[PDB]
Amino acid sequence: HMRHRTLSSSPALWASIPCPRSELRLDLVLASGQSFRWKEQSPAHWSGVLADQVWTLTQTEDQLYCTVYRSQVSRPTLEELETLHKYFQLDVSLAQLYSHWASVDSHFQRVAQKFQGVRLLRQDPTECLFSFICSSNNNIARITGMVERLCQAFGPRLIQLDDVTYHGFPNLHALAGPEAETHLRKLGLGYRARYVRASAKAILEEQGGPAWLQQLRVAPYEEAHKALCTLPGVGAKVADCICLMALDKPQAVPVDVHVWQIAHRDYGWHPSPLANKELGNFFRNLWGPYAGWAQAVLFSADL
Ligand SMILES: CC1(C)CC(NC(=O)c2csc3cncn23)C1
Ligand code: NI
């Protein structure tokens, strides 16, 4: 009986954040393989869960409109609005980064002209870690399915809008239980079910809980990366995604075969674990300390 809001349907329940579409394009960020929890439930309107709350987001050329579902219905609070400002990292100027990258990279300049407003979300470490464990040998639509079924089966029910039931991301204890792997295989995760259960268990038992991920957020990149790579199902590529996307390491550059292809084809680059590391160093040396943000532009431009 509760329905997803549109800007038309519910004018009184939207706040706005001044946001040029050069600083953020929702449609190039929210289903571009960073977060797997946003869906365009009606045209130009993106709905998904942030913490214990559902949001719907839409934008004009100059304004980002948001509405939150929790309580009697009301507009987002200043605090809730600050959460969203932090999630999109809107303190950082994307126009200024784009021009700094273009100054040393003509390929980026060409490719970025049509793909403005591609920025990096600042994601919850737990959600990001388990989402990217599920991302091995996978595509966006299937990862999206696995994450949603995982949240339904293990996370707290938040609300229903139209036919969509929203759940919070599970805690580690929920993912670490004795039937968790078997249940996750029923939900279609395959071998990734093992890594989910075992990484939840590892963080709880060997690292002291989720405070450990917050510690990695403040630790230096190389230390964070090394620490993540001790987890089941987390190798260099996945660790770099998490570094970039959840641990505030903007220089982290995830290297897979697709980045090799681009580097070789579009940059003329020529040199395994060692060469993958060398390629990440190449892009840091070229673009600087926000190299992973630059790569996100190219990734989201290639989609
Ligand atoms: C396995 C996937 C479909 C999900 C993964 N996402 C990315 O690799 C990515 C999104 S933005 C960025 C910057 N560097 C890597 N990425 C591909
Ligand atoms: Ni060649």
Side-chain angles (χ1 to χ4, degrees):
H1 81 297
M2 273 167 211
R3 291 177 64 84
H4 289 272
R5 295 166 195 162
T6 66
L7 198 57
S8 296
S9 84
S10 323
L13 298 171
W14 297 79
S16 57
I17 309 185
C19 189
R21 272 185 62 115
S22 55
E23 284 303 300
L24 173 62
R25 278 185 65 186
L26 292 182
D27 71 320
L28 296 185
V29 174
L30 292 189
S32 307
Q34 295 183 45
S35 168
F36 300 97
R37 298 274 266 137
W38 294 96
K39 296 181 198 207
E40 200 179 2
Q41 293 291 160
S42 58
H45 290 78
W46 295 84
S47 296
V49 169
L50 279 196
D52 47 1
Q53 295 181 328
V54 181
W55 295 76
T56 301
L57 303 179
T58 196
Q59 63 182 338
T60 61
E61 254 301 323
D62 63 309
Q63 294 286 343
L64 170 69
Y65 288 100
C66 38
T67 193
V68 62
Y69 319 72
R70 322 169 177 104
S71 288
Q72 196 222 306
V73 301
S74 59
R75 296 217 258 253
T77 71
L78 295 174
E79 276 190 66
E80 287 168 339
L81 281 185
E82 286 162 8
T83 298
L84 205 65
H85 203 262
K86 190 57 173 180
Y87 186 66
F88 288 114
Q89 307 197 81
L90 287 176
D91 287 350
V92 178
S93 172
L94 196 57
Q96 285 178 56
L97 282 174
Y98 270 54
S99 34
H100 189 50
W101 300 320
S103 76
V104 287
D105 190 358
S106 64
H107 179 252
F108 177 93
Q109 188 177 76
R110 278 201 273 289
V111 178
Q113 261 174 192
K114 194 197 149 325
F115 296 99
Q116 291 183 66
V118 181
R119 54 166 60 238
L120 265 297
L121 307 173
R122 180 162 185 281
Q123 298 188 52
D124 169 66
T126 293
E127 176 174 335
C128 186
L129 162 65
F130 289 104
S131 301
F132 275 92
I133 284 171
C134 293
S135 77
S136 72
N137 297 276
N138 216 348
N139 61 60
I140 287 171
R142 273 181 73 224
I143 300 162
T144 297
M146 289 179 189
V147 166
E148 177 176 356
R149 289 186 309 262
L150 178 151
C151 289
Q152 179 176 220
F154 289 85
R157 183 217 197 255
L158 301 182
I159 196 169
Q160 179 174 354
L161 300 172
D162 295 298
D163 302 322
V164 185
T165 300
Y166 289 92
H167 287 251
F169 206 82
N171 61 41
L172 292 174
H173 176 91
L175 292 180
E179 302 300 324
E181 173 178 351
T182 297
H183 194 181
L184 281 170
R185 285 175 178 279
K186 293 179 179 179
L187 298 187
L189 267 76
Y191 68 82
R192 306 172 191 73
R194 178 183 289 106
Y195 296 151
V196 167
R197 174 183 183 256
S199 290
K201 278 193 84 166
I203 293 160
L204 281 181
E205 293 166 16
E206 309 276 349
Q207 306 291 351
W212 180 64
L213 291 175
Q214 180 48 47
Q215 286 175 357
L216 299 191
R217 178 172 277 193
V218 304
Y221 166 39
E222 298 83 7
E223 197 196 316
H225 186 283
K226 190 189 173 169
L228 290 176
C229 288
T230 71
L231 296 177
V234 177
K237 143 62 155 151
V238 165
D240 274 311
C241 292
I242 300 164
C243 283
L244 174 62
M245 289 182 203
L247 302 184
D248 291 335
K249 315 306 181 230
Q251 70 271 48
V253 176
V255 174
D256 62 8
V257 78
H258 299 249
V259 321
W260 264 73
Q261 164 61 15
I262 284 173
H264 173 262
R265 183 186 70 225
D266 302 324
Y267 289 91
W269 182 86
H270 304 79
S272 80
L274 201 53
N276 283 350
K277 175 176 286 302
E278 178 192 1
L279 178 50
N281 291 348
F282 172 77
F283 283 119
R284 273 185 287 285
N285 177 78
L286 176 64
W287 288 323
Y290 281 76
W293 290 44
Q295 177 160 282
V297 178
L298 295 192
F299 180 94
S300 295
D302 168 294
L303 267 190

